[PDB]
Design a protein around this motif. Structure first.
Motif, mmCIF file in Angstrom:
data_model
loop_
_atom_site.group_PDB
_atom_site.id
_atom_site.type_symbol
_atom_site.label_atom_id
_atom_site.label_comp_id
_atom_site.label_asym_id
_atom_site.label_seq_id
_atom_site.Cartn_x
_atom_site.Cartn_y
_atom_site.Cartn_z
ATOM 1 N N UNK A 6 16.645 115.070 -1.819
ATOM 2 C CA UNK A 6 17.722 115.338 -2.765
ATOM 3 C C UNK A 6 18.653 116.387 -2.167
ATOM 4 N N UNK A 7 19.946 116.076 -2.120
ATOM 5 C CA UNK A 7 20.967 117.012 -1.668
ATOM 6 C C UNK A 7 21.982 117.215 -2.781
ATOM 7 N N UNK A 8 22.408 118.457 -2.977
ATOM 8 C CA UNK A 8 23.421 118.779 -3.970
ATOM 9 C C UNK A 8 24.651 119.364 -3.287
ATOM 10 N N UNK A 9 25.831 118.874 -3.667
ATOM 11 C CA UNK A 9 27.090 119.344 -3.107
ATOM 12 C C UNK A 9 28.112 119.442 -4.230
ATOM 13 N N UNK A 10 29.215 120.142 -3.947
ATOM 14 C CA UNK A 10 30.257 120.403 -4.945
ATOM 15 C C UNK A 10 29.666 121.065 -6.187
ATOM 16 N N UNK A 11 28.776 122.032 -5.973
ATOM 17 C CA UNK A 11 28.124 122.692 -7.096
ATOM 18 C C UNK A 11 29.105 123.641 -7.765
ATOM 19 N N UNK A 29 14.616 106.088 1.708
ATOM 20 C CA UNK A 29 14.284 104.982 2.611
ATOM 21 C C UNK A 29 12.997 104.306 2.177
ATOM 22 N N UNK A 30 12.938 102.993 2.412
ATOM 23 C CA UNK A 30 11.796 102.159 2.028
ATOM 24 C C UNK A 30 11.545 102.242 0.523
ATOM 25 N N UNK A 31 12.628 102.201 -0.250
ATOM 26 C CA UNK A 31 12.576 102.370 -1.696
ATOM 27 C C UNK A 31 13.866 101.793 -2.257
ATOM 28 N N UNK A 32 13.756 100.936 -3.278
ATOM 29 C CA UNK A 32 14.954 100.325 -3.854
ATOM 30 C C UNK A 32 15.941 101.376 -4.352
ATOM 31 N N UNK A 33 15.478 102.293 -5.192
ATOM 32 C CA UNK A 33 16.265 103.439 -5.640
ATOM 33 C C UNK A 33 15.337 104.358 -6.424
ATOM 34 N N UNK A 34 15.887 105.469 -6.907
ATOM 35 C CA UNK A 34 15.144 106.413 -7.729
ATOM 36 C C UNK A 34 15.703 106.380 -9.144
ATOM 37 N N UNK A 35 14.818 106.196 -10.120
ATOM 38 C CA UNK A 35 15.208 106.160 -11.521
ATOM 39 C C UNK A 35 15.729 107.523 -11.969
ATOM 40 N N UNK A 36 16.602 107.516 -12.983
ATOM 41 C CA UNK A 36 17.133 108.779 -13.495
ATOM 42 C C UNK A 36 16.009 109.661 -14.023
ATOM 43 N N UNK A 37 15.021 109.047 -14.676
ATOM 44 C CA UNK A 37 13.890 109.800 -15.199
ATOM 45 C C UNK A 37 13.133 110.497 -14.074
ATOM 46 N N UNK A 38 12.972 109.820 -12.929
ATOM 47 C CA UNK A 38 12.237 110.411 -11.816
ATOM 48 C C UNK A 38 13.063 111.484 -11.125
ATOM 49 N N UNK A 39 14.382 111.294 -11.062
ATOM 50 C CA UNK A 39 15.256 112.325 -10.515
ATOM 51 C C UNK A 39 15.239 113.582 -11.375
ATOM 52 N N UNK A 40 15.227 113.414 -12.699
ATOM 53 C CA UNK A 40 15.170 114.563 -13.596
ATOM 54 C C UNK A 40 13.878 115.363 -13.426
ATOM 55 N N UNK A 42 12.088 115.513 -10.594
ATOM 56 C CA UNK A 42 12.192 116.156 -9.290
ATOM 57 C C UNK A 42 13.169 117.323 -9.330
ATOM 58 N N UNK A 43 14.306 117.139 -10.001
ATOM 59 C CA UNK A 43 15.312 118.193 -10.077
ATOM 60 C C UNK A 43 14.800 119.418 -10.830
ATOM 61 N N UNK A 44 14.004 119.209 -11.882
ATOM 62 C CA UNK A 44 13.453 120.342 -12.622
ATOM 63 C C UNK A 44 12.549 121.199 -11.743
ATOM 64 N N UNK A 45 11.727 120.564 -10.904
ATOM 65 C CA UNK A 45 10.843 121.309 -10.012
ATOM 66 C C UNK A 45 11.609 122.067 -8.935
ATOM 67 N N UNK A 49 13.892 124.581 -13.540
ATOM 68 C CA UNK A 49 14.506 124.447 -14.850
ATOM 69 C C UNK A 49 13.691 123.512 -15.733
ATOM 70 N N UNK A 50 13.955 123.591 -17.033
ATOM 71 C CA UNK A 50 13.338 122.668 -17.976
ATOM 72 C C UNK A 50 13.832 121.253 -17.705
ATOM 73 N N UNK A 51 12.938 120.274 -17.868
ATOM 74 C CA UNK A 51 13.316 118.882 -17.630
ATOM 75 C C UNK A 51 14.406 118.428 -18.595
ATOM 76 N N UNK A 52 14.366 118.921 -19.832
ATOM 77 C CA UNK A 52 15.331 118.536 -20.852
ATOM 78 C C UNK A 52 16.706 119.161 -20.652
#
Ligand SMILES: [Mg+2]
Ligand SMILES: [Mg+2]
Ligand SMILES: [Mg+2]
Ligand SMILES: [Mg+2]
Ligand SMILES: [Mg+2]
Ligand SMILES: [Mg+2]
Ligand SMILES: [Mg+2]
Ligand SMILES: [Mg+2]
Ligand SMILES: [Mg+2]
Ligand SMILES: [Mg+2]
Ligand SMILES: [Mg+2]
Ligand SMILES: [Mg+2]
Ligand SMILES: [Mg+2]
Ligand SMILES: [Mg+2]
Ligand SMILES: [Mg+2]
Ligand SMILES: [Mg+2]
Ligand SMILES: [Mg+2]
Ligand SMILES: [Mg+2]
Ligand SMILES: [Mg+2]
Ligand SMILES: [Mg+2]
Ligand SMILES: [Mg+2]
Ligand SMILES: [Mg+2]
Ligand SMILES: [Mg+2]
Ligand SMILES: [Mg+2]
Ligand SMILES: [Mg+2]
Ligand SMILES: [Mg+2]
Ligand SMILES: [Mg+2]
Ligand SMILES: [Mg+2]
Ligand SMILES: [Mg+2]
Ligand SMILES: [Mg+2]
Ligand SMILES: [Mg+2]
Ligand SMILES: [Mg+2]
Ligand SMILES: [Mg+2]
Ligand SMILES: [Mg+2]
Ligand SMILES: [Mg+2]
Ligand SMILES: [Mg+2]
Ligand SMILES: [Mg+2]
Ligand SMILES: [Mg+2]
Ligand SMILES: [Mg+2]
Ligand SMILES: [Mg+2]
Ligand SMILES: [Mg+2]
Ligand SMILES: [Mg+2]
Ligand SMILES: [Mg+2]
Ligand SMILES: [Mg+2]
Ligand SMILES: [Mg+2]
Ligand SMILES: [Mg+2]
Ligand SMILES: [Mg+2]
Ligand SMILES: [Mg+2]
Lengths: 134, 143, 259, 178, 60
Positions: A6-11, A29-40, A42-45, A49-52
């Motif tokens: 995960x990379x964040x830019x234009x913060x 790579x070797x993955x169709x995509x990442x679901x929004x739920x799974x990104x949330x 990962x981003x919380x960790x 921050x809180x997942x919500x």
RNA sequence: AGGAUAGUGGCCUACCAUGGUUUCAACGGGUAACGGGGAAUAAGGGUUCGAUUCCGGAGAGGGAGCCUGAGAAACGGCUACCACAUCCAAGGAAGGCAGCAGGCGCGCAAAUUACCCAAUCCCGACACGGGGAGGUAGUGACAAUAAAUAACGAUACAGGGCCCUUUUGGGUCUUGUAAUUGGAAUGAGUACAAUGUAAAUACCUUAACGAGGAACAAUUGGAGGGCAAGUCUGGUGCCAGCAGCCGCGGUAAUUCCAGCUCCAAAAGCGUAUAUUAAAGUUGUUGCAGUUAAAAAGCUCGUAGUUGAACCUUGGGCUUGGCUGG
């Protein structure tokens, strides 16, 4: 295989809306995509921050796969998030219930039907009942 | 001095003279007189529908000798009667009296073509079905 | 046409907003206010297209309804409020103060200023005349009315507004050698000193302005805004570039070296 | 309504439909570069025909003219960038001397075959169309993709392709899995 | 002109033409492959008869 | 001079003058005429178009007159008349899609009586409501972009290409032929799913499925000339038909109807009409007028057009910025 990156830019820190907002780059790579739920999750960790308080949307996968780009918001609290969020995103995250209303045709027809009544509905229907002596 | 004014202040004479002399161009006259709008059977349109009045047949011009198989069609839009050629071997049998036919020009832009005398239109469709489709048995006439 | 227009087509919006063609059919119609429609910048464009703080028009209304945005020291909640030249925008939540000054490319620059400079503003005097009971007053470029001005102040002068009391601190007389920014025409955004004022009774007076690079251009008096008492002494902080217009070849050379 | 979206045609047909010299030249030129149809030759001629028109207008201007210097150098720089124009021919007189084969050299289809990744030029197009070739880390499946000079060195098999270290394809998995 | 004539002979030749079915021949290649086929046929294996080059030589 | 108007003004009135426009084309007529930004084509100069994404104007079946209001002579406001036209218990009442969708008619000619305020913006007392404005999808070969319909081998057999070589006989590497033989590659489609979205569809990614006659089968026009490609085969026999034009058809038809083969363009190709170039066949650039069309029978002549030459030149002095070198 997996190795989601995960990379964040234009913060931008936005205390006007009590949130931090950024562009999200996902390397899967070797993955169709990442679901929004799974990104949330990962981003919380990553940012402790809180997942919500994390919202992601508007994702698109590049040609050939292996990478997606989107937009993300992180609020200072769940209460701040619930105040400054669209209704449809809160329903996406399970933080709200989809409001149940009739179709636009039914709402419009009812509005125009009520336009023919002056005064209370109780008075109008009682008087209409009196006319129909049946 | 070439018979036309050359002075720098003679633009009006030059403009009017050219304006006067373009009327000698028959192509120009038809565009401004609106002759297609006024005189053409189609009223200036590329196509026109009509009703078949009768199957008749036109004798070809010399040195050719043949029977060009046409129909008499009354246009729906203005009620005028025109003669329309029916192309291909035996397509006259696809056209019956009181059928609705779509017409188009012969492509010579108002003049007759070849040995066919006085015919400026051809049949494109009959009863809403392409005559070419009927000829090649792609479709069948709705009847 | 039976009344005032209330919509703004996207294609008919002022070009300096730099709006995209395909984002919608309409553009924000600036409200009535201190600045003219063609010469203003609605707060919705500033908070979303310029600062990119808000992601859409729904969010800019949420920002302003919490009382964050102040223009010229007063809280404004009108999303299409017509902010203009020399206006001060304060966001104390982000602790930022901006002044709307044109950059040399003809657009409203994102010009951050210090809190100390955000305590005042400049206004071009449009007219001086007598009100009721014989009280003289000055009308500035943003529609401000200041009573009891210095009797030496005349039209085309620039006054320094206290911006908290609305009074005049001091002024600059319009004369040769004053520092000027151009607020109209194709020379919009350039900064220079007055070289020669050419008068035309009954017509439009023309002002000859010399750039810091000794480039000379001519513009109408209505497009002239006095900003300093002499060269190199502006009364407000200038945006990046200092209002000096470079040719496209010069810009290409500068961009090549920077990168 | 919404603002109109611009579009334009990218080719132009010849004025004389039947001319053996042009027909033979086109087919000979299509066979060399493995083109699908004549429109891919018309496209190169169309964009080259308007490059010459731009160059002619600048050449009528005086030398050292600001417009001639700025836009002429930019056009030359762009042509050098895609490898069509050589580094020793930046004079805008060699621009007029350009030929359609200069542009067909820089297609992705031409470079794949000329880099040895394919047996023939017709193998190059099917490799490109079948998502086997990647430029940098991005898969490109457009045969007419114009290779830049700095992108020239990064043409290779896609990392997830069977020929470039990816897994076996559909056909092989059906045979070896029985 | 005098215009009239018997309509009985309409479609005479096409009606009496003996129907012949098309032989179920191999498909021709489409797209880029067909341009490849034509290029070789005209510039690789030239079939010229010492300066007499014919695209569709009738058998003679 | 007054009246009226928000206000100038024959805008209107009273009184009074006889003025005002026009061959530099007034006035009148036509317009298959809303104006402009612009569109098509274009060596230059031009020709043709602009109902239609923006601006300005005008209208809401045709007129006229008004109320409210800052703003309307408003029409999803009213009053009246005309033309259409609806319900009726026959006493009465109610209409205006050139808004969205849809229907009838007209025609050569143009799509769904769908979803939504999530985006763009607008309105309101307004952080909250409303918005067929707007967005989304449906139909959609109007146009435009990119771009599949196969690729590569192996053997066979032929030629060239070379080499062992005098040829001979071979080794051998570049093409062409193979109902002559393989294993690879992939998306059209479909699909778990995720993304997309207000919610969906689709796109983009992507498990599993998904190509040998790879029937997952490219078509539209032509093959005498113009104009690229048949003097092949069968049929007909001035018939049927073709043929933009020239022409073809009367028993081996290079032109018809077909089969084969070939040519051109190709997800597009043909036809009709208009228009532009070609058209130096509208000619200012740039036509022609003895005989091909075309100098008024001849002079005069107003307007128009066009009109001989001539008035500080030369010299000298310093003088900056540039450009050879
Ligand atoms: Mg109610
Ligand atoms: Mg009510
Ligand atoms: Mg006449
Ligand atoms: Mg014409
Ligand atoms: Mg003849
Ligand atoms: Mg019909
Ligand atoms: Mg104001
Ligand atoms: Mg103010
Ligand atoms: Mg040929
Ligand atoms: Mg008066
Ligand atoms: Mg008045
Ligand atoms: Mg009209
Ligand atoms: Mg017009
Ligand atoms: Mg227009
Ligand atoms: Mg228009
Ligand atoms: Mg009309
Ligand atoms: Mg309009
Ligand atoms: Mg109106
Ligand atoms: Mg109507
Ligand atoms: Mg009205
Ligand atoms: Mg209405
Ligand atoms: Mg209205
Ligand atoms: Mg409608
Ligand atoms: Mg249509
Ligand atoms: Mg319909
Ligand atoms: Mg869309
Ligand atoms: Mg196919
Ligand atoms: Mg599918
Ligand atoms: Mg699917
Ligand atoms: Mg979803
Ligand atoms: Mg065919
Ligand atoms: Mg030929
Ligand atoms: Mg025969
Ligand atoms: Mg011809
Ligand atoms: Mg015979
Ligand atoms: Mg024969
Ligand atoms: Mg022949
Ligand atoms: Mg022929
Ligand atoms: Mg034939
Ligand atoms: Mg071809
Ligand atoms: Mg021309
Ligand atoms: Mg001539
Ligand atoms: Mg002539
Ligand atoms: Mg002549
Ligand atoms: Mg002539
Ligand atoms: Mg004669
Ligand atoms: Mg004479
Ligand atoms: Mg003279």
């Amino acid at each position: 295989s997996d190795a989601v990156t995960i990379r964040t830019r234009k913060v931008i820190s936005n205390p006007l809306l009590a949130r931090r907002q950024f562009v999200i780059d996902v390397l899967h790579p070797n993955r169709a995509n990442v679901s929004k739920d799974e990104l949330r999750e990962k981003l919380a960790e990553i940012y402790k921050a809180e997942k919500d308080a994390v919202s992601v949307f508007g994702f698109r996968t590049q040609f050939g796969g292996g990478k997606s780009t989107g937009f993300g918001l992180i609020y200072q609290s769940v209460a701040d998030a619930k105040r400054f969020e669209p209704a449809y995103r809160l329903v996406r995250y399970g933080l709200a219930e989809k409001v149940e209303k009739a179709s636009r045709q039914q709402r419009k027809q009812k509005k125009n039907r009520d336009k023919k009544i002056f005064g209370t509905q109780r008075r109008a229907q009682k008087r209409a009942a009196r006319r129909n002596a049946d | 001095g070439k018979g036309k004014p050359r002075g720098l202040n003679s633009a009006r004479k030059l403009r009017v003279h050219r304006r006067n002399n373009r009327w000698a161009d028959q192509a120009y006259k038809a565009r401004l007189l609106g002759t297609a709008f006024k005189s053409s059977p189609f009223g200036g349109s590329s196509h026109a529908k009509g009703i078949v009045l009768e199957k008749i047949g036109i004798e070809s011009k010399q040195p050719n000798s043949a029977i060009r198989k046409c129909v008499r069609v009354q246009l729906i839009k203005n009620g005028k009667k025109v003669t329309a050629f029916v192309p291909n071997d035996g397509c006259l049998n696809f056209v019956d009296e009181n059928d609705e036919v779509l017409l188009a020009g012969f492509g010579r832009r108002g003049k007759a073509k070849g040995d066919i005398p006085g015919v400026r239109f051809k049949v494109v469709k009959v009863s809403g079905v392409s005559l070419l489709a009927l000829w090649k048995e792609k479709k069948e006439k709705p009847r | 046409a039976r009344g005032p227009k209330k919509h703004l087509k996207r294609l008919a919006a002022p070009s300096h907003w730099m709006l995209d063609k395909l984002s919608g059919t309409y553009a924000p119609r600036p409200s009535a206010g201190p600045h003219k429609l063609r010469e203003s910048l609605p707060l919705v464009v500033f908070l979303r297209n310029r600062l990119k703080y808000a992601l859409n028009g729904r969010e800019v209304k949420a920002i302003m309804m919490q009382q964050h945005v102040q223009v010229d020291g007063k809280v404004r909640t009108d999303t299409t409020y017509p902010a203009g030249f020399m206006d001060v925008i304060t966001l104390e939540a982000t602790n930022e103060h901006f002044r709307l000054v044109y950059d040399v490319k003809g657009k409203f620059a994102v010009h951050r200023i210090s809190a100390e400079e955000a305590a005042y503003k400049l206004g071009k005097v449009k007219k001086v005349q007598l009100g009721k009971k014989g009280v003289p007053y000055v009308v500035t470029h943003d529609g401000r009315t200041i009573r009891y001005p210095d009797p030496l102040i005349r039209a085309n002068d620039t006054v320094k507004i206290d911006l908290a009391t609305g009074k005049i601190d001091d002024f600059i007389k319009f004369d040769t050698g004053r520092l000027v920014m151009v607020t109209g025409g194709r020379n919009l955004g350039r900064v220079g000193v007055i070289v020669h004022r050419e008068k035309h009774e009954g017509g439009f007076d023309l002002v000859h302005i010399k750039d810091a690079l000794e480039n000379t251009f001519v513009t109408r008096l209505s497009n002239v805004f006095v900003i300093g008492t002499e060269a190199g002494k502006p009364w407000v902080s200038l945006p990046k570039g200092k209002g000096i217009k470079l040719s496209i070849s010069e810009e290409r050379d500068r961009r090549r070296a920077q990168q | 309504p919404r603002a109109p979206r611009t579009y334009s045609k990218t080719y132009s047909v010849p004025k004389r439909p039947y001319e053996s010299a042009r027909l033979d030249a086109e087919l000979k030129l299509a066979g060399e570069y493995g083109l699908k149809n004549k429109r891919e030759i018309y496209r190169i001629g169309f964009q080259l025909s308007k490059i010459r028109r731009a160059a002619r207008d600048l050449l009528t201007r005086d030398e050292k003219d600001p417009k001639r210097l700025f836009e002429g150098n930019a056009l030359i720089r762009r042509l050098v960038r895609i490898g069509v124009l050589s580094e020793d021919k930046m004079k805008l007189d060699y621009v007029l001397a350009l030929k359609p084969e200069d542009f067909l050299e820089r297609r992705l289809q031409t470079q794949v075959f000329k880099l040895g990744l394919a047996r023939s030029i017709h193998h190059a197009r099917v490799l490109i169309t079948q998502r086997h070739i990647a430029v940098g880390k991005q898969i490109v499946n457009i045969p007419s993709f114009t290779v830049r000079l700095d992108s020239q060195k990064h043409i290779d098999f896609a990392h997830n392709s069977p020929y470039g270290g990816g897994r076996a394809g559909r056909v092989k998995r059906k045979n070896q899995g029985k | 002109g005098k215009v009239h004539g018997s309509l009985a002979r309409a479609g005479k030749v096409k009606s009496q033409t003996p129907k012949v079915e098309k032989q179920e021949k191999p498909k021709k290649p489409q797209g880029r492959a067909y341009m490849r086929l034509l290029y070789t046929r005209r510039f690789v294996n030239v079939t010229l008869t010492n300066g007499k080059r014919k695209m569709n030589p009738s058998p003679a």
